[PDB]
Symmetry: D4
Subunit: 155 residues, 8 copies
Amino acid sequence: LTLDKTDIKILQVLQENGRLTNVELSERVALSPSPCLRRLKQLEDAGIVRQYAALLSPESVNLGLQAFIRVSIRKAKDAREDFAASVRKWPEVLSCFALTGETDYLLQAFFTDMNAFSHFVLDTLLSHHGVQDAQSSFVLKEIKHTTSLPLNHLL
Amino acid sequence: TLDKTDIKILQVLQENGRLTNVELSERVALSPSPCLRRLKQLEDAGIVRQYAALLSPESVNLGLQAFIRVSIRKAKDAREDFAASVRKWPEVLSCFALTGETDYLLQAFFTDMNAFSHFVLDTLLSHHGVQDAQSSFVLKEIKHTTSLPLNHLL
Amino acid sequence: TLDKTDIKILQVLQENGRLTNVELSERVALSPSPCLRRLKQLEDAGIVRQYAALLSPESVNLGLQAFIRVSIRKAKDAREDFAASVRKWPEVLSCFALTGETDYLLQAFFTDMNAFSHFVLDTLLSHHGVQDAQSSFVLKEIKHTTSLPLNHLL
Amino acid sequence: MPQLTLDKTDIKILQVLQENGRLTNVELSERVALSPSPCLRRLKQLEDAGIVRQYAALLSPESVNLGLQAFIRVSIRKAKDAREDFAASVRKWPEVLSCFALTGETDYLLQAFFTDMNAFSHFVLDTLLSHHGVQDAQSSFVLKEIKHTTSLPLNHLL
Amino acid sequence: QLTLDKTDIKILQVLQENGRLTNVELSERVALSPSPCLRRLKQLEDAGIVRQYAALLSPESVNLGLQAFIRVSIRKAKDAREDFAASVRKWPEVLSCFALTGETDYLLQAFFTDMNAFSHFVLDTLLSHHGVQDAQSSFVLKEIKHTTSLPLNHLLK
Amino acid sequence: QLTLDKTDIKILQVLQENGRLTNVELSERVALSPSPCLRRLKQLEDAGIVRQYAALLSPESVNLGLQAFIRVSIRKAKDAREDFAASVRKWPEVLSCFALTGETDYLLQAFFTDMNAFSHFVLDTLLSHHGVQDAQSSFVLKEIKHTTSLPLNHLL
Amino acid sequence: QLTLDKTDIKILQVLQENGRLTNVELSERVALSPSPCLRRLKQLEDAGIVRQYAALLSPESVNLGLQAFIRVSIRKAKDAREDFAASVRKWPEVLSCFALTGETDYLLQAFFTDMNAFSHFVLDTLLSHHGVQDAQSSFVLKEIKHTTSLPLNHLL
Amino acid sequence: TLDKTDIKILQVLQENGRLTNVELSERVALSPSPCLRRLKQLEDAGIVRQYAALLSPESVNLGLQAFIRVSIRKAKDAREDFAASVRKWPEVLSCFALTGETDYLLQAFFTDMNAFSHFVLDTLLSHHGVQDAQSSFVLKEIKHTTSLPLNHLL
Ligand SMILES: CC(C)C[C@H](N)C(=O)O
Ligand SMILES: CC(C)C[C@H](N)C(=O)O
Ligand SMILES: CC(C)C[C@H](N)C(=O)O
Ligand SMILES: CC(C)C[C@H](N)C(=O)O
Ligand SMILES: CC(C)C[C@H](N)C(=O)O
Ligand SMILES: CC(C)C[C@H](N)C(=O)O
Ligand SMILES: CC(C)C[C@H](N)C(=O)O
Ligand SMILES: CC(C)C[C@H](N)C(=O)O
Ligand SMILES: [Ca+2]
Ligand SMILES: [Ca+2]
Ligand SMILES: [Ca+2]
Ligand SMILES: [Ca+2]
Ligand SMILES: [Ca+2]
Ligand SMILES: [Ca+2]
Ligand SMILES: [Ca+2]
Ligand SMILES: [Ca+2]
Ligand SMILES: [Ca+2]
Ligand SMILES: [Ca+2]
Ligand SMILES: [Ca+2]
């Protein structure tokens, strides 16, 4: 159905604390336990909540190097498919978007250090047949990073 | 200091963060009590910085996802005011000071191309520190996960 | 050769291509009998290539106006085939071979980024001649008129 | 929305008018399968409710000695109303037909016509660049017009 | 090799601007007897310094109102560089050509009547050539300065 | 305005290659008597067709074996584009200078003895100029073709 | 993995600056006994720390007036990265070669006599090589700083 | 004054800077006494500007080699202050004013990406003269020698 302010605040609270209890959740939305849990399921089935996940600290797991790699695919057949299917099998790459502009594709990957990166790029990214060109930048400082989408545009 | 079981939790949790101790204990092949101290222990540390509900963007009218490349003005204030402003802009999820010709990279979600129009013109570029902005748009999500790779710890 | 009076006709007609022979007789200080000949003499010659209804994009749900900067292959007939193709794509209104870094420039209209994505990925780039493309979108229309300047003719 | 108030014939009106904009209700109606009174009804509503914003004559640039079509990319300055004053001034330049605030490296893109490269030189050096807001300009020219129509596509409303 | 002095340099300075002075005139401007003056100038030619005497026309005056600078990029063959060079030599509208450093392989200086004329060249000749991978051209809005004259002061001690 | 006929142009073609001919020598190839042939070339040079006769020297022969094409950016100011234009005119090592379209504001053609002299130029004088915002220079590796001669077939 | 003692650093600081020193001279700079200076040093050399001792010459002194940096791009063909690598190793005019991140695939530092020398190298060697897709070179106008000495205070 | 022998001295010494005169005097086909005579004069002139020990970065924990393309502010003499500063930063081994888009180029070494970040953001960009910096990093070292070519002197 349509989301009303109640359905939003849930999403708002949950995008920030996705491991709450239905009890805690209700206590933060002015809802009764059962009526809360009903509305959350609706939201889940209707694709609105696509996954509950535990966000780790990159540094905590020795992942220092956060890479933004701008690749450029080949003008060949099934080059964009093979590439896509490949990038889906590389755990070091978390995200991947076909972008407007000079950049054909953009990858956000994590690595131990520059060595790890060098090995990745040289012996896997660039080895892929469909990769024609790669060009990568590194994060010096994380100004802001959240998974929480904006929701005021539904009020 | 992490160990093999300690880790296997993280892999499981990263993908299903809303598990029950009983369930998580099961997978990591632990008992609830010793499982729970570990999972806690890991949070105590900061290994897990948050559990979050991940939303479908289109599901919520946000169809337009932009990566903007901003270049900040060269002044002592410029970097901090801008930093403090971008933290207060909810349509922008991420922000990174990068290497290369791009000084700062912004990830943001918007309702449609018009919404973007008002954001950049009436907020982004209006900010005194913002000297120039240059933006691209996602045509296709090939892959998007939040789960870090962990095999380099084994 | 056009005289000051012919010039006034074309200027009036470029702005209201539906104007009556009478009001035209007025705006150009003439009689409707001769005045009509001047216009006929124009259409018939070839100064006036077309009269058109201009619609408002938003009005018909075309909120996304695109400018695509293509690069054609260095093929004997890549130039021909592509040109033939862009002629049949109703989403692309104009197409120019420019000077500079860009080989061709396309101005075209879409419903939304989705409609775009499908066009660029399944039709633009799928075309054999198209080597690479990079497009930018219209945040704001500061001015847009089909009327040419004519003061250089007096 | 355009599916709530528009039906087959209404969309055939706008297709036919976009290409032959200076007819008469009878002439047009004589081509959409209607009559000189009902056709007017639907027609007087399209241009009443914002659809048909203008009827215009389209001239041949070379015909009127305009043989140099230029696509200038301008970067505005980070003053304040730099963006206002520029916008206001672009509208006063007859040589500049269109002006758009685009995404990408370019801030604004102007489409303009001139007589010859001299005319253009004088325009850029003496006007575009002389304006206080214009920080930089870079311009390319049209070598060959592959396709140019003012008519929008409407098949997305069916 | 020759040894050039004040009086020989002046000869070259004077000639680089007035390539049509007589020997007499030239002899008075540099303060020499016509006879040895002449010898000198022939010596200066005989030494390879004076490559050519030419008349310089005003493009505008001969309806070549549009001057271009075309940054062309040559394909990767072996013969591409030579075929292209040898073809550019035969294009009269193309006056100069230079293999430059940086992102440009070759830079061309060419003159045309107008943009139609240019369009016709680029699309039907330059890009038609098998070696030309890509072209990217700009045009002269204003000629702030243009001289054939080399500087020679560095030679004076 | 002068109305150029088939012969007049020839006179320009032949001159553009050999600008030091004797009026007789010219008479003898243009198909004009020494009197008319003479008067015309004057009509031509007075009209503004023939703007000058110059000796063309060999760069390398005079130790100048480093040709530079500088792409410069001028600061947008009231006293900017003027001052720079006037300065470039008094810089002997810069032969030509063009305000061209595209990403470059100005293109400069300049000759130097070596990379060091260049260095001194750009650092101490080109970039020291207050109008000069940015400089980006390349160098000629090989001169495929260089002629002063304009084409004139378009007038036939 | 290292965490060298407060003077073991010093030895490598001094030796990076005066690499032909006599153990006696080395001792009077780090304030050790003349014997422990071949102990501390023995160890360091006997690891991988000191890769080599070289005489550094003055480029203009040997006529190499033209120091150039070349941004090369490999073909995304086959073993292009190998053949090229092995070839750059054989070109003595090319001192350094680094595979960088960014729009540039490879960066080369080289030295030449004058701009001509460079032209011959580029057209007749670099670009002739099968793997080299495009080259793009800038030159050094002025050397602000140049030392072979690595910073070591991060080990204290 | 720089004959064939003097070059065979320099070729040998650039590779083995700590070469025994006994050995050196052999590798050039000289007797010891006149060999020591030639090298001396070669360094008393300036040909041999320094003898130095070259270390292995990885060995000293400097994993990140990096090329920063600086751009100096066109101020009164930012050019001077910056130069004087860059000589005081030991992390930056070399700095060159190059032709092209790049005003200055710096070659510098660091421990890790964080060290780098600290330098750029708190030292490089904080200097008043620095208008912008863009930096690329060494993925792999195909070749690096301090020895110049000398065949051109034969
Ligand atoms: C798929 C991408 C390469 C599309 C391209 N960036 C464009 O703007 O059209
Ligand atoms: C802080 C940023 C301006 C850093 C810059 N993008 C770099 O390459 O180091
Ligand atoms: C209107 C402009 C300031 C827009 C900006 N250049 C962009 O890339 O989106
Ligand atoms: C048709 C295009 C490839 C022409 C090219 N952009 C030029 O400036 O010459
Ligand atoms: C005067 C110059 C700065 C003009 C500029 N190159 C342009 O194409 O608009
Ligand atoms: C060697 C190159 C292809 C590396 C690439 N330019 C990058 O930034 O990762
Ligand atoms: C002739 C060109 C291919 C030279 C190349 N642009 C360079 O900088 O070395
Ligand atoms: C010193 C630098 C600003 C010089 C500039 N890179 C040029 O090519 O002229
Ligand atoms: Ca692209
Ligand atoms: Ca979408
Ligand atoms: Ca930058
Ligand atoms: Ca809009
Ligand atoms: Ca191009
Ligand atoms: Ca034309
Ligand atoms: Ca911009
Ligand atoms: Ca002109
Ligand atoms: Ca090149
Ligand atoms: Ca030379
Ligand atoms: Ca490393």
